[PDB]
Curated annotation (Swiss-Prot), chains A, B, C, D, E, F, G:
Residues that span the membrane, as ranges: none
Main location: virion
UniProtKB keywords: Capsid protein, Virion
Name this polypeptide is given: Coat protein
Subcellular location(s) of the protein: Virion
Source species: Satellite tobacco mosaic virus
GO MF entries: structural molecule activity
Tagged with keyword Translocase: no
Additional detail: This virus depends on tobacco mosaic virus for its replication.
GO cellular component: viral capsid
Length: 147, 147, 147, 147, 147, 147, 147
RNA sequence: AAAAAAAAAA
RNA sequence: AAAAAAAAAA
RNA sequence: AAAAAAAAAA
RNA sequence: AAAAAAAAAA
RNA sequence: AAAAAAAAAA
RNA sequence: AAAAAAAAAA
RNA sequence: AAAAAAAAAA
RNA sequence: AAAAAAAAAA
RNA sequence: AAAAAAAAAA
RNA sequence: AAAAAAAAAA
RNA sequence: AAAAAAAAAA
RNA sequence: AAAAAAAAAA
RNA sequence: AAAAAAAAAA
RNA sequence: AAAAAAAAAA
């Protein structure tokens, strides 16, 4: 009931309720991946299941959106860039969403949203997307629903 | 943005956001304890941290309310009863909140709410409350905030 | 139902209700302490648990406010004064709330309120506050919640 | 003053107030009595004064209402029943308020209210009412004012 | 009364008021801590009591919020980052609030607020939080109430 | 943000703010001075800087108002009286604000306000005012701004 | 013109104005007189002209009202009293306005107002009123217009 | 707030 | 009147 | 309620 | 009329 | 009151 | 929100 | 827009 | 603007 | 503010 | 007209 | 009409 | 709330 | 519907 | 919501 109350008070409990010891969880997971120049890196869904994110008890996840930022400085004379290519078990996309920095000292960023019709579960062996960048590390923040 | 959209679309990401790989979680945890006749059982807070509830990564928890139900049938000729005595590190209470069944085939239940001023963190070695019952098992559902 | 009724009437009782034989109690407890000149006296919480106040069955108490009055006359030529320094298990305060009389024949008084965030339980061995006065006895009235 | 305040604040206390170290207390007292078949049991008021209810410091009580429930199962083939006959020092009543269960596995219950004109004090040696039941134990919940 | 008045004017003083020579004080305290790479640094509450902040007369403090900024440049090729893990005497948290810079020449920052239920006093020997950063110095600004 | 919140939450800190480790402080300082019969006592500003008031870190103060009360009983047959003469570095005043008691057992009191045009800083060697009284001690409460 | 202005500004003065180096002054003059038991004391107007009141440059005064208070304690067992009999150069009054204390430790007081038709000037040799009291000193506060 | 004395004003 | 603790209610 | 000092905010 | 200083007031 | 120059501001 | 290209509609 | 300093005005 | 701490008020 | 996941409610 | 994809905008 | 005791009710 | 029985009423 | 935790937004 | 007991208040 909120408060103003300074002592323990009785709750008039009823019948035993429906319960669930292992619920779902909506999250924004931050992690980094190492990228090599001119080579696409396939980001594994397995990266989302870890004690470091309190998610090692889940075996599936529904990804809703993916955002990426360059995480280290770009090569001399260049502006940072990052590209994302969505991957799906039913058929990979060929879109190459790209963000470029406008100040050499700033991160490049881009993201993409997955439509409802493509929001099925993915497991550790599946891949989320392909990342390309002129920077050696890319930081991702993935919005998803663990279940 | 919701949908009607059937394909992946670009998100115009900005600067890197504030992140947290290990967030807090509000939960209703269900577990059972074995009770002996005429003896109070002290419920340990440690029972709330377990891979069975996806909470083994937490070391502290703020308890908000406790509800209890008898979980096995009572002795012959009796109606089930359950009593709860709140325990606190700064000083134990002597209240004995009690619920009794009105049908011998039904569970007895009772609960108590912890006021805001007493909502500090508790760790595995601390106890939540004392349970007394004429039934050999009591089912608890604890509402709490893992942090 | 109040009355106008002059005879016993039936109550159509239902199921057995939630009960508690040992409830909480909000009180204003009056007691006196002996004080020596130039020496602070630490007021023990144990003073609040006594058959003299019908509170010997409690082992914890949540203090909400403390008010103090000088209880004997001050030394010749002086006006009475009383100072209160709040004490807390998590860290003592250094505030010295003080009241002085404006008529030599009148009591000096002062009090302090404990904020919600500091209203945790205290037990017999804990201290409430430090009292200083030029009078040999101080009368305290403590508002608290026994639980 | 409630709060939002996170520190101790001064109270501008006035004159010494009217006090009372031993106040009255309005309560709902739960206790059980053993009953034999076909014999009325006179419930003593003395049962209300006990350290088990935090009321051993009182010597008088004003009873406002009495509710009773069967507390053990009835004899084979029967439905539980409980009857209450009000007793008063100025003259006993002959009313036999009765409740019967409609499911053999459920408690029978009934109660009666004492009108204002009959609410005088009672002491340990006085009796509250007579209880009759086909069950060996009856649970009573008495609403009263200890003074 | 404000003014327009150019000379001293009389105040019709009444009775001696309630006084307090040592009041509480709400403050925003700025200080820096040295951090080593890959090692968490526990920030002591003792850092808040110092003649440099006019707070050496206090022995307790209630912390309300903590904000941190990187104070020196990050290692070559990296963007600054700072993480804060709240610590509490009743149980430490495992949250790792983190801020990262989006321009290599800019400070990274993050903060956290302590809820009312966890705002108890802390003393010199207690710790406020754990700080982690890729920068050798972190600047903190702590909002608190000295008492 | 106030609350209802029971756990630590993230603050999205921005740029490093303007800070000040040694702020100003508005206060009401209570202290006593010894006075001899028929002799004026010059109250030094130095009395306001002391660890006893948490103000030993300040070297200047702007006085806003001065109130004085007799602090010991007057000579036999007399009513207490107190006079205040304002002093200023740019030129002393010759006003003698005076308060007299109307009951021999009560304190005499008077005060004066300093206008805005005369509110400049004063240091330890400066004097605030001259006090005269038939009582051996005078209690002053000075409202000022330490800076 | 008041201000907000921080520098000296020009005043466009006109013709030389009407001036007066020695103006009138409305005042409340406080002074004490010694009284003997059972003897009336005639208060001289000359008492109002003194360097102690900044009025030694005046030779006349128009008295508007006279208030008197006992200034020392009364004889043992008695309550203080003070009587005032108005005196006038055109004819003395026989009214004996009297005030008595209702607490032995408190001053007795009374006053009288002079009507417009009797407000002519008085000089040093004239008397204001006759004072009678059981106290050895009487304090007067006279409202007048020096001219 | 209203008045009177000294000062000030569009 | 508004709150909190105990009791009571259509 | 209005102000000032310290803190906080959409 | 509005202000400030001294005085006065229901 | 309206303007211009210097200063100041939510 | 308004437009244009591809798709869709009562 | 409001203020202050210098200038200007029916 | 709203709050809290210190100060101030008809 | 509106939504979804976990918690809470008259 | 309303939607979705690509483009455009104060 | 309003109340109290016994009975009755959508 | 409406009724009936016993009681009560301006 | 209102709240709190995680996520999302013009 | 209304009451009573304990506590609190402009
Ligand atoms: N009230 C009960 O107390 C618990 C927490 O209440 P509160 O935190 O919303 O006040 C749960 C709610 O049903
Ligand atoms: N749009 C972006 O797509 C993600 C999920 O959107 P939706 O699930 O709310 O439509 C995130 C949001 O900012
Ligand atoms: N009526 C019942 O009678 C008891 C006291 O009623 P009263 O004192 O409020 O009239 C209890 C209430 O439920
Ligand atoms: N304020 C004082 O503080 C105490 C508790 O206040 P609160 O609990 O109602 O805020 C008492 C009250 O007079
Ligand atoms: N007037 C008195 O003068 C002092 C300061 O007043 P001011 O600074 O608010 O004008 C104090 C107040 O009670
Ligand atoms: N919210 C942040 O939390 C701190 C304290 O908030 P609260 O005490 O006003 O709720 C600071 C404020 O910006
Ligand atoms: N302006 C002139 O300045 C002096 C004082 O003004 P002020 O104190 O009323 O602002 C005089 C007035 O005519």
């Amino acid at each position: 009931t909120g408060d103003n109350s300074n002592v323990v008070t009785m709750i008039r409990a009823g019948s035993y309720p429906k319960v669930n010891p292992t619920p779902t969880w909506v999250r924004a997971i931050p992690f980094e991946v190492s990228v090599q120049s001119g080579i696409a890196f396939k980001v594994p869904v397995g990266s989302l299941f870890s004690a470091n994110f309190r998610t090692d008890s889940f075996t599936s996840v529904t990804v809703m959106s993916v955002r990426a930022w360059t995480q280290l400085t770009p090569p001399v004379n260049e502006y940072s860039f990052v590209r994302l290519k969505p991957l799906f078990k039913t058929g990979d996309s060929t879109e190459e969403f790209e963000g470029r920095a406008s100040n050499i000292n700033t991160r490049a960023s881009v993201g993409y949203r997955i439509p409802t019709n493509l929001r099925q579960n993915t497991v550790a062996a599946d891949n989320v997307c392909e990342v390309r960048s002129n920077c050696r590390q890319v930081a991702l923040v993935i919005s998803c629903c663990f279940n």
